[PDB]
Design a protein around this ligand. Structure first.
Ligand SMILES: [Mg+2]
Ligand SMILES: [Zn+2]
Ligand SMILES: [Zn+2]
Lengths: 43, 183, 160, 196, 133, 773, 65, 86, 114, 264
RNA sequence: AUCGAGAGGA
């Protein structure tokens, strides 16, 4: 429940890849798998 | 955390200080004059940083990196590069805060490879557990609740804020890594 | 490229050889250059190889490229399968893609064509054509539900 | 599944007497294969077993927080003070024979979690079932007693195998077989037909 | 039903190898220059020390499922300390006037070379190896 | 596309799969509920009327039962509800829908369905519990693991369909893969590990364990093997029991590294008559690779013997491993302190070298590399230094790891684990790569906000010195997380692309079949191949073998293949052949020998023309060496006596053999020439394998032995010829697709996008390149 | 939710010890491991059941219905 | 096309039974055996139709003629007795 | 759902014979005895005591699947010795040793004071 | 004492007995431990019927707890298994009926213990079905904790059973086994980073056995005739009775084999 | 039925 409450959705040049700007603002490893892997992120 | 020199041309120091930590711990113990996170922000001891603001600043992972450093070392400890950094605008509260709740559940994720951590962050969503205390009163469409939930033997310091110890979702099994009967 | 050639004694020995690798391809100009062996030269691009040297050289280059990708994986696939794919693209004089442009555009079959892609347009074009499907294709028999001309279904068994 | 990305499916359930036992009589609640561990490189699962053994004997909670300098050597020292081996290997005896096992086996308290997926919900079997009206084909899903779908890839696999009759039987007899009447003059099923 | 070869052998060296139970043994024929031997033996059953002199015998016999000795009246064919059974994988000639025999005894390999033996030795799957202290 | 090509099917089930060592390879463990639910119509026969009546009496609730009975009229009779269910009397011609019973054919299918191997016939065995049970060795063709994977089972409804499933789709038949000419299934996981630990000479088996293991082999001769050691104690080598598991009359020769006949390393393997002489069983002998025991047993005896061998090997090895045990543990990842210091100083010297190269770049005293920007050269040098440092630290760890180390045991056996895993857990995980590059500065001039601006040092650039055991710093963890995220994205994107590619290839090649004229043709009759594979032979039964004429020094080839009756030194020794004394002079037999030598020389030139590399081993129909070894073991020649064969007989018989074989039967000059082209390489191989000097030197084959070898070579070739009607196009498309699914992506397009350009024949190319010689 | 009756691995009854364990650690400020030793659970299979247990029953009892 | 007969002597198809041919012959014979077909081979302890079919194939008793087909359409008919099984 | 009942593992059902004796093939005196609803516990002790008897050449230990409780024993004896007699003598010896152990332990406990 | 096995007891307690087995085959000791875990009969609740449940815990949860509760089984041999008895559902000689009624009358939450469970069925003069309390206070195992205004009324039927059918019927919790403590037989090879003696602690059972001699060669005949065991009992059956019943159950199993042979 | 969301395997 807690992780579902902190969820991001990015509709759709390399958004899926973990970015340096994401450090400390997005969890590095929590993401959906297969489809929309990295498109959806957890704060 | 905000880092500025304690004296100009004195050692730069994290603005928070032990006495402030003691007041925070005293306020937390009452559960005097309250000392909150908002109190720290109004004191100017801590600051909120946007990514664009993050670009212009230089931050330090560990508060002990900041204090001045002028032999033998345990071989097991991880190799930490000396920071060699003159200026630090800020210091991170704790590196583990970069991790999410599911990653905070993961034990020793530094010692493990990242893809396995991702798989576990999904599987923890899938795993059973007591979601709420009022489940018996509530009528959800589907609910799975463990008979005898057991708090984890190895706990992250973030788990106390996660309330995972209070509301565990797994059992401390006795597991042997063995080849018995090939099953 | 440390090539290997017969020794004067006879046993195969390796001698280093100088090789040029070019970011660009102008095969007709490059092969007609002094100081190179025009037989040995090979191109990454198979379309140019076929256009300069005919369909068969392009066929060989196509098999070699597929072999290169399978070797980068390290997996091995038998020569007959890759060769069959390359011969499918090669028997038609122009190289035929595995995409709908090509094999699905090829006139053979009607419902077999519409199974892969552009189903409704292929059926429209067939109706305008008034073409006749032999139903000899496996896919067409699958739509028909008739027993497909698979190896087991190919022969006809009758009484003595 | 374990807390370190090791997922698993219960192959078999064993009574305590059959299961291998340490000298103390402790029997593993769960047995995992060693072979899984090398490829995953999930060292932290092994470290969790060691640390939780130390915690259980000491009665003090163990910290597995990342980016905290904790020595496996130090945890091993605490285990040695407890008397259990620094590596956590315990001498085990084969359950059926009582013979001492030749190789000592890593024995530890590991946190494990029960995944939502359970077999009895997953199983579906249909011999004859309801059919969707337009398709005249089997319905979808277990809840409707709906048949599994012979994929296009499955049909390709069957062409590769070469069994025309099985492909036909799954293609027509198993699903949406139908008889229609057509006319020789026009290849269209415009002929009305009273069989009686 | 009689031994094919008998000799006294003095071990030049013992090599444990990676295994701790099984060591390879390099030895030469005593009083004969021609034979030389290299054999896989188990230390735990019988200890082999460097410079030891050991009696070596190869016998054809003395199929049938191995029977535990029914009674003590059934007579051991050897007072030798060590006995092994194996099959030779290849009979070779080192050079003209030199013959080497390669025997695998349950995966424990033994090569012994000398010219005079190959008239005795035969391509026989049966072999009984006898070592006396 | 969907409902007409692929339909939801009745008599279909799906379950989570688990693995049982005791269940046979061809068998599938079908739950009793599934067996009761699924029914097959069996027509009532005079043979089955008693059994069928009993099944109908037993009812749907208990198996063996029957859900429905079908009259001659065809109106259904429901056994669950009927007033007459008790009093049914079977009438001839009725159809009883019997419950799915043991030892029946079904089809077991994995949902990726990339290969014909993914859909294989299995023998039903009704199991109590709920999970589908399958053997371990069948996991690999299915690409299946017991992580919750689900698989589907389809039931035949007609007798002809059952016959097709049993005669073509059965698991033992599908062991040998057409593609890659290798077995699909090999001994995997514990057994593999266990078998190596069983095959060590240090491993010995006591009498009680020997007796139990002897019993565990379901087919046992009943003869206790004579103990390897007798007088000190009746010890048994694990090789002896394992040999009792190996079928008799099967001989394997594998030479690796220093494979001395004394084999001190216990490397390589020699098996004679199903008895192992030397070696420790590693993966390649019990693995899916060519030359393994699986391939040899499948060809020599048959698929059934091979599957039963799978089962027996599994049982014996699992029993012994259960009594020995195994455990990875934390301590097998740890390394000795001195080795860890060496690893750390190796990383430190790599860092010092990188810093020195960086200072050289700053000074602009960097030598120009043609076609390479100087920063590009700096990046390549730093990447190479870090990679070499990680690999060298891994080598130090591997040398440090003892022979008792269980991860080392798994790697030596080949069950699971690699050198890179050892390096990453023990010493250093290395430098993470994003988009084929070191971690870029997402922040301006900084990879991370903690790092200073314009830092190209490896720690800032993402190289993780620390091992998994040591623990990873937060910056290192974030860089590793970026790498892993890219890995997941690449994995999913790859799977999608390979799915589209496989459908394209299958739809393109589905029409192709080998016709009865032996010409590969499409539906319209357009010929793709006049001769399939250009040799006219099935992809199975082909094994790579060495062509002895090609390669080697010319003088050595003459020494091995030239015998001259006129020169005494050239003339064969009289001991080899009884006619040898008679053969001196004999000028006409010598000119026949000269003819054979001229043919061999022309063939050597021809093969050197075919392959510039001149690699000795190429895929070939019949392995001559196996036939020769079988002949030698069958006829038991002491090899001291001269051969009964005459010199003229060898040459004449080889020539007659070459004459006899026809890929295409007919006597037409075009057809005859096409066949001669088809068998030219095989004929060259046969000439290399059987030369007169070779036939009298490599062995003392009797005349009957040479005749038997000739007949067996001919018969094996005839078996190896491709069966007409085989849909080669679909098999080819799947054969490309499955490695492509496994395919994962010096600066050249590789893997899936390069394959996409090749298949699309797209004019634009990401990296055009010309190789000028 | 409530104390397990017995430890899953071996089967020693652990329901009786929970109240005395809580009371012991409260009365004497005792270390948890020493409290388990006084309780008599000398094996970690038994010790995990008491140490890692959570009484959610109190939270359920707090609910009025 | 029609009456595209092939002379018995001039048949070029493979004398060995194709695996598909054996599979279909065995399946058809088993199917007919299930439907009360006469059995031309003496059976000992065999009730499965397929087992009877394989024994009959060994005896070469099956009176079935396979029509080998060619891309041209001309048909070469081979009896089961004539095709060797190996 | 699919799982067998626990009562099945220690109860014989449908009139199953506790011991099924069948003559073994390819060995003269060898016989296979299928112990039904029996576990490893009895089988290992029977096999050990059978190995103790000199006349028994062979005695085996098999469970064909852990799901079902059937213990298979193959016994091969000396000529003139019935394998059934060998198994009976082994069983009798087991009972004597168990009784002696019971008496000795009872005496020791009577000596024990706590 | 007697020819054959001789047992020497290290220590005696009501909960646990530590003993030493001499002149014993290893398979016999393994079989005895497996019988002690599994084969010994014991009485536990096999049916639960609840009329009123206001407890927060579900009825199935409480029934499982009740099944795990120890019930005295010293006289269990007189009691007959339900499957052997001719009663339609339960017989007084077959089954023992317990009743438990607890209401949360107090504002403070009231506990429910095994001492509250009381027996309706006639004892018939056998020590059967008594709830077992090793607790110093005498408070039984806590089945449930009841809020104010909460009541629970249940009836339990306890039947004879064994541990192989269900783990609750097992008399003994843990069996401690040690043989070849010095590893003279070398049945196992120790995993050591540097030296096996340093890494592996010396067992307590080593000191009773004679220390190994480094010059003495390893002997291959030796099968350990000495075993060091400790038995721990729940309390349903006394420790001495636990091991004696294990012995006797093994004897009965062997006798069943023998009589089956005679019938054959 | 339709659409959407989520999840499982690779
Ligand atoms: Mg999976
Ligand atoms: Zn019409
Ligand atoms: Zn316990």
């Amino acid at each position: 429940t807690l992780s579902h409450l902190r969820r991001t959705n990015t509709p759709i040049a390399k958004p899926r890849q973990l970015h340096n700007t994401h450090w400390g603002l997005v969890c590095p490893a929590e993401t959906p798998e297969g489809q929309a892997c990295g498109l959806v992120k957890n704060l | 955390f905000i880092v500025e020199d304690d004296e100009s041309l004195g050692h730069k120091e994290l603005k928070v200080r032990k006495g402030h930590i003691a007041k925070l711990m005293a306020t937390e113990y009452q559960d005097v004059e309250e000392y909150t996170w908002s109190s720290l922000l109004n004191e100017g001891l801590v600051e909120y940083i946007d990514a664009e603001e993050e670009e212009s600043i230089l931050i330090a992972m560990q508060p002990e990196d900041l204090e001045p450093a002028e032999l033998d070392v345990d071989p097991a400890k991880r190799i930490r590069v000396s920071h060699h950094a003159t200026t630090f605008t800020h210091c991170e509260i704790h590196p583990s805060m970069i991790l999410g709740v599911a990653a905070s559940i993961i034990p020793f994720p530094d010692h493990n490879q990242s893809p396995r951590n991702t798989y576990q962050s999904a599987m923890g969503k899938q795993a059973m557990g007591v979601f709420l205390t009022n489940y018996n009163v509530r009528m959800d469409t589907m609910a799975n609740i463990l008979y005898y939930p057991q708090k984890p033997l190895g706990t992250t310091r973030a788990m106390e804020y996660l309330k995972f110890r209070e509301l565990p979702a797994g059992q401390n099994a006795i597991v042997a890594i063995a080849c018995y009967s090939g099953y | 490229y440390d090539r290997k050639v017969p020794s004067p004694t006879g046993e195969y020995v390796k001698e280093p050889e100088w090789v040029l690798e070019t970011d660009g391809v102008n095969l007709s100009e490059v092969m007609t250059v002094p100081g190179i062996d025009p037989t040995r030269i090979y191109t990454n691009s198979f379309i140019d190889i076929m256009e300069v040297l005919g369909i068969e050289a392009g066929r060989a280059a196509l098999y070699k490229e597929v072999y290169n990708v399978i070797a980068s994986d390290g997996s091995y696939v038998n020569y007959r399968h890759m060769a069959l794919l390359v011969d499918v693209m090669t028997t038609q004089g122009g190289l035929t893609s595995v995409t709908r442009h090509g094999f699905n555009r090829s006139n053979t079959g009607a419902l077999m064509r519409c199974s892969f892609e552009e189903t409704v347009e292929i059926l429209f074009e067939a109706g305008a054509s008034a073409e006749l499907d032999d139903c000899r294709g496996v896919s067409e028999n699958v739509i028909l539900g008739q027993m497909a001309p698979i190896g087991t279904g190919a022969f006809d068994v009758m009484i003595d | 599944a374990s807390r370190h990305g090791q997922k698993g499916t219960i192959g078999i359930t064993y009574r305590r007497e059959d299961m291998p036992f340490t000298a103390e009589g402790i029997v593993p609640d769960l047995i995992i294969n060693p072979h899984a561990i090398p490829s995953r490189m999930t060292v932290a699962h092994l470290i969790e077993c060691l640390l939780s053994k130390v915690a259980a004997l000491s009665g003090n909670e163990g910290d597995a927080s990342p980016f905290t300098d904790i020595t496996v050597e130090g945890i091993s020292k605490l285990l040695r003070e407890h008397g259990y081996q620094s590596r956590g290997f315990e001498v085990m005896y084969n359950g059926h024979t009582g013979k001492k096992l030749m190789a000592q086996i890593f024995f530890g308290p590991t946190y494990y979690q029960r995944l939502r997926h359970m077999v009895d919900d997953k199983i579906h079997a249909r011999a004859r079932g309801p059919m969707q009206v337009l398709t005249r084909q089997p319905v979808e899903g277990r809840s409707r007693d709906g048949g599994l779908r012979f994929g296009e890839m499955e049909r390709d696999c069957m062409i590769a195998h070469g069994a025309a009759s099985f492909l036909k039987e799954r293609l027509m007899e198993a699903s949406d077989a139908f008889r229609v009447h057509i006319c020789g003059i026009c290849g269209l099923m415009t002929v009305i037909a009273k069989l009686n | 039903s009689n031994t094919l070869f008998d000799d006294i052998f003095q071990v030049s060296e013992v090599d444990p190898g990676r295994y701790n139970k099984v060591c390879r043994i390099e030895a030469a024929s005593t009083t004969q220059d021609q034979c030389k031997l290299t054999l896989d033996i188990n230390v735990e059953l019988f200890p082999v020390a460097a410079q030891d002199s050991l009696t070596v015998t190869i016998a054809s016999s003395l199929t049938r499922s191995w029977r535990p000795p029914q009674a003590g009246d059934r007579s051991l064919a050897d007072d030798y300390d060590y006995v092994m059974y194996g099959t030779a994988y290849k009979f070779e000639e080192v050079s003209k006037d030199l013959i080497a025999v390669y025997y695998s005894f349950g995966g424990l390999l033994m090569r012994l070379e000398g010219n005079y033996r190959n008239l005795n030795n035969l391509k026989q799957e049966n072999a009984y190896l006898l070592i006396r202290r | 596309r969907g409902n007409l090509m692929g339909k939801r099917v009745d008599f279909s089930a799906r379950t989570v799969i688990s693995g049982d060592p005791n269940l046979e390879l061809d068998q599938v463990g079908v739950p009793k509920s599934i067996a009761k639910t699924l029914t097959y119509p069996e027509v009532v026969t005079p043979y089955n009327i008693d059994r069928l009546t009993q099944l109908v009496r037993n009812g749907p609730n208990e198996h063996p039962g029957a859900k429905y009975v079908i009259r001659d009229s065809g109106d259904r009779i429901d056994l669950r509800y009927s007033k007459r269910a008790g009093d049914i009397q079977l009438q001839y011609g009725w159809k009883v829908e019997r419950h799915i019973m043991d030892n029946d054919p079904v089809l077991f299918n994995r949902q990726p369905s990339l290969h014909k191997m993914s859909m294989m016939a299995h023998r039903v065995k009704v199991i109590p519990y709920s999970t589908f049970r399958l053997n371990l060795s069948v996991t690999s063709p299915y690409n299946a693991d017991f992580d919750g994977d689900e698989m589907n089972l389809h039931v035949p409804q007609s007798e002809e369909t059952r016959a097709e499933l049993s005669q073509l789709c059965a698991v033992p038949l599908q062991i040998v893969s057409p593609q890659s000419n290798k077995p699909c299934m090999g001994i995997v996981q514990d057994t593999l590990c266990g078998i190596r630990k069983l095959t060590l000479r240090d491993t010995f088996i006591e009498l009680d364990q020997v007796l139990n293991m002897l019993y565990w082999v379901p087919d046992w001769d009943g003869v206790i093997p004579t103990p390897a050691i007798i007088k000190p104690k009746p010890l048994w080598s694990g090789k002896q029991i394992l040999s009792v598991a190996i079928p008799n009359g099967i001989h394997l020769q594998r030479f690796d590294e220093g494979t001395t006949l004394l084999s001190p390393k216990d490397n390589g393997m020699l098996i004679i008559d199903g008895q192992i002489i030397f070696g420790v069983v590693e993966k390649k002998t019990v693995g899916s690779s060519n030359g393994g025991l699986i391939h040899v047993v499948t060809r020599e005896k048959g698929p059934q013997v091979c599957a039963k061998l799978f089962g027996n090997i599994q049982k014996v090895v699992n029993f012994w491993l259960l009594h020995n045990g195994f455990s990875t543990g934390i301590g097998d990842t740890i390394a000795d302190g001195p080795t860890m210091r060496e690893i750390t100083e190796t990383i430190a010297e790599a860092k010092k070298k990188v810093l020195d190269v960086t200072k050289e770049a700053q000074a602009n005293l960097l030598t120009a590399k043609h076609g390479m920007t100087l920063r590009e050269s700096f990046e390549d040098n730093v990447v190479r230094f870090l990679n070499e440092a990680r690999d060298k630290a891994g080598r130090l760890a591997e040398v440090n790891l003892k022979d008792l180390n269980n991860v080392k045991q798994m790697v030596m056996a080949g069950s699971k684990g690699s050198f890179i895993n050892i390096a990453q857990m023990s010493a250093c995980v290395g430098q993470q790569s994003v988009e084929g590059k070191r971690i870029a500065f997402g922040f301006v001039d900084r990879t991370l906000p903690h790092f200073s601006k314009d830092d190209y040092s490896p720690e800032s650039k993402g190289f993780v010195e620390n091992s998994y055991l040591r623990g990873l710093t937060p910056q290192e963890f974030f860089f590793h997380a970026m790498g892993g995220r890219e890995g997941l994205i690449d994995t999913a994107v790859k799977t999608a692309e390979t799915g589209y590619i496989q459908r394209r290839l299958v739809k393109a090649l589905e029409d192709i079949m080998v016709h009865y004229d032996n010409t590969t043709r499409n539906s319209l009759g357009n010929v793709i191949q006049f001769i399939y594979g250009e040799d006219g032979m099935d992809a199975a039964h082909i094994e790579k073998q060495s062509l002895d004429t090609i390669g080697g020094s010319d003088a050595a080839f003459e020494k091995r293949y030239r015998v001259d009756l006129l020169n005494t030194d050239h003339t064969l020794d009289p001991s080899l052949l009884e006619s040898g004394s008679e053969i001196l002079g004999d000028l006409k037999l010598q000119v026949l020998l000269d003819e054979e030598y001229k043919q061999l020389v022309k063939d050597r030139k021809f093969l050197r023309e075919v392959f510039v590399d001149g690699e000795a081993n190429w895929p070939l129909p019949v392995n001559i060496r196996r036939i020769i070894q079988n002949a030698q073991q069958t006829f038991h020649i002491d090899h001291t006596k001269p051969s009964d064969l005459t010199i003229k007989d060898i040459v004449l018989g080889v020539k007659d053999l070459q004459e006899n074989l026809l890929v295409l039967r007919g006597k037409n000059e075009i057809i005859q020439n096409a066949q001669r082209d088809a068998v030219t390489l095989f004929c060259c191989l046969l000439r290399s394998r059987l030369a007169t000097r070779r036939v009298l030197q490599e062995y003392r084959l009797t005349k009957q032995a040479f005749d038997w070898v000739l007949s067996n070579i001919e018969a094996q070739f005839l078996r190896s010829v491709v069966h007409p009607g085989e849909m080669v196009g679909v098999l080819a498309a799947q054969s490309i697709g499955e490695p492509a699914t496994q395919m994962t992506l010096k600066k050249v397009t590789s893997g899936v996008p390069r394959l996409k350009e090749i298949l699309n024949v797209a004019k634009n190319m990401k990296t055009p390149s010309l190789t000028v010689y | 939710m409530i104390v397990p009756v017995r430890c899953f691995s071996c089967g020693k009854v652990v329901g009786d010890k929970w109240e005395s364990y809580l009371n012991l650690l409260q009365e004497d400020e005792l270390d948890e491991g020493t409290a388990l030793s006084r309780l008599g659970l000398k094996r970690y299979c038994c010790r995990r059941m008491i140490l890692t247990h959570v009484d959610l029953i109190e939270k359920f009892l707090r609910y009025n219905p | 096309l029609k009456e595209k007969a092939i002379p018995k002597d001039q048949r070029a198809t493979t004398p060995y039974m194709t695996k598909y041919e054996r599979a279909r012959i065995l399946g058809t014979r088993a199917l007919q055996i299930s439907m009360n077909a006469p059995v031309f081979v003496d059976l000992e302890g065999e009730t499965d139709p397929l087992r009877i079919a394989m024994k009959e194939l060994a005896e070469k008793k099956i009176p079935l003629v396979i029509r080998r087909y060619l891309p041209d359409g001309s048909f070469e008919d081979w009896s089961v007795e004539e095709l060797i099984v190996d | 759902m699919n799982a067998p009942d626990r009562f099945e593992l220690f109860l014989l059902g449908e009139g199953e014979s506790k011991l099924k004796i069948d003559p073994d093939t390819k060995a003269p005196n060898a016989v296979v005895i299928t112990f039904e609803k029996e576990d490893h516990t009895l089988g290992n002790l029977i096999r050990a005591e059978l190995l103790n008897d000199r006349k028994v050449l062979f005695a085996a230990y098999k469970v064909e699947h852990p799901f079902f409780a059937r213990f298979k024993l193959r016994i091969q004896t000396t000529e003139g010795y019935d394998p059934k007699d060998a198994l009976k003598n082994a069983c009798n010896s087991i009972i004597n040793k168990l009784g002696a152990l019971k008496t000795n332990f009872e005496t020791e406990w009577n000596l024990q004071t706590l | 004492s007697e020819e054959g096995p001789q047992v020497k007891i290290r220590e005696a307690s009501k909960d646990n007995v530590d003993f030493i087995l001499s002149n014993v085959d290893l398979a016999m000791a393994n079989s005895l431990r497996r019988v002690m875990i599994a084969e010994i009969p014991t009485l536990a609740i096999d049916s639960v019927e609840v009329e009123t449940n206001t407890t927060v815990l579900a009825d199935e949860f409480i029934a499982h707890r009740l099944g795990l509760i120890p019930l005295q089984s010293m006289d269990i041999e007189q009691l007959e298994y339900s499957r052997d008895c001719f009663c339609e559902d339960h017989c007084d000689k077959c089954s023992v009926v317990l009743t438990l009624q607890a209401f949360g009358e107090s504002e403070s939450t009231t506990n429910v213990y095994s001492k509250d469970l009381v027996i309706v069925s006639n004892l018939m003069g056998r020590n059967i079905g008594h709830p077992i309390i090793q607790d110093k206070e005498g408070n039984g195992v806590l089945i449930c904790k009841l809020r104010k205004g909460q009541e629970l009324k249940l009836t339990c039927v306890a039947k004879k059973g064994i541990a192989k059918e269900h783990a609750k019927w097992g008399p003994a919790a843990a069996i401690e086994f040690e043989y070849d403590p010095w590893n003279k037989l070398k049945h196992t090879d120790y995993w050591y980073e540097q030296d096996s003696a340093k890494e592996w602690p010396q067992s307590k059972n080593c000191e009773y056995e004679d220390p190994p001699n480094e010059g003495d060669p390893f002997d291959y005949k030796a099968q350990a005739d000495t075993f060091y065991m400790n038995v721990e009992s729940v309390g349903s059956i006394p420790v001495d009775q636990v091991v004696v019943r294990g012995i006797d159950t093994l004897q009965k199993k062997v006798a069943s084999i023998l009589l089956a042979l005679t019938q054959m």
